[PDB]
Amino acid sequence: SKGEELFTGVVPILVELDGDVNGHKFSVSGEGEGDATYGKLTLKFICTTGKLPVPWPTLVTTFVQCFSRYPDHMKRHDFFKSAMPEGYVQERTIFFKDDGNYKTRAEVKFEGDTLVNRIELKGIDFKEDGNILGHKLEYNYNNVYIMANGIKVNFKIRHNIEDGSVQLADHYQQNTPIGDGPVLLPDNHYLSTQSALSKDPNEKRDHMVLLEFVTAAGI
Structure with missing residues (x-):
């Protein structure tokens, strides 16, 4: 694919998100780089408007599956890179069980040699004292199913709650x-996928450091 050659080396990434969750407005800027040869992502995100009003882990999936490692024998199944450089629209609904939902609209495309993910997030029906607006989720992270001029994707994420339960x-x-x-x-x-969340010990802004490895499988 067209797209594939754009990903044979290390590519800079920018992520820009504007959000409104139950009327709590916020923005996030992220920077880092991707190396799809190894399915590898390294990013740092900063909440530019102050304190993030939701837990950082709940935004990981929203914050570039073109950096997934497709094995050679699965090359013909890599939608994500094939859409580059003009890019793709990515839309989600994320339903938090017994709580509210996020709806996201994003565009991921190249701007010059940089891969950019621009997102608008809307969250409604959250509980003021639930796990999300109440910040009861641990700062940690624990398959993504793809089917077929676009794709449909479905999966579950289990967020750890500070009491030992799961959201x-x-x-x-x-x-x-x-x-x-x-x-x-x-x-x-x-x-x-596997994701690891950390903090930059010299950063005083609200932020997240993310290291991820992703490999396509199933064929």
């Missing part, structure tokens, strides 16, 4: 190409 986040996702060029429509398969 389920059911994800429903759709992606479509922004340009006219042909894209690769995949056979059913999944992505296997």
Whole structure:
């Protein structure tokens, strides 16, 4: 694919999000780089408006699956890179069990040699004293199913609650190409991810450091 050659080396990434959750408005800027040869992402996000009004882990999936490692034998199934450089639209609803939902709209595309993820997030029906607005989620993280001029993606995330329980986040996702060029429509398969969240000990702003590795599988 067209797109694939754009990802054979290290690519700079920018993430810009504007959010409103139950009327709590916020913005986040992220920077880092991706190396799809290793399925590797390294990013730092900063809440530029002050304190983030939701837990950082709940925004990880919102904050560039074009950096997934597709094994050679699965190359023909990589939608994400095939849409580049003109990019794709990514929309989700994320349903937090017994709490509210996020709806997101994003565009991911190249701006010059940099891969950019621009997002608008809207959250409604959260509980004031629930796990999200009450900041009861641990600062940690624990398959992503893809089907077929775009893709549909579905998966569950389990966020750890500070009492030892879990807060389920059911994800429903759709992606479509922004340009006219042909894209690769995949056979059913999944992505296997692992994420690690940390803090920069010299950073005083509200922030998250994210290290992720993602590999496509299932074929």
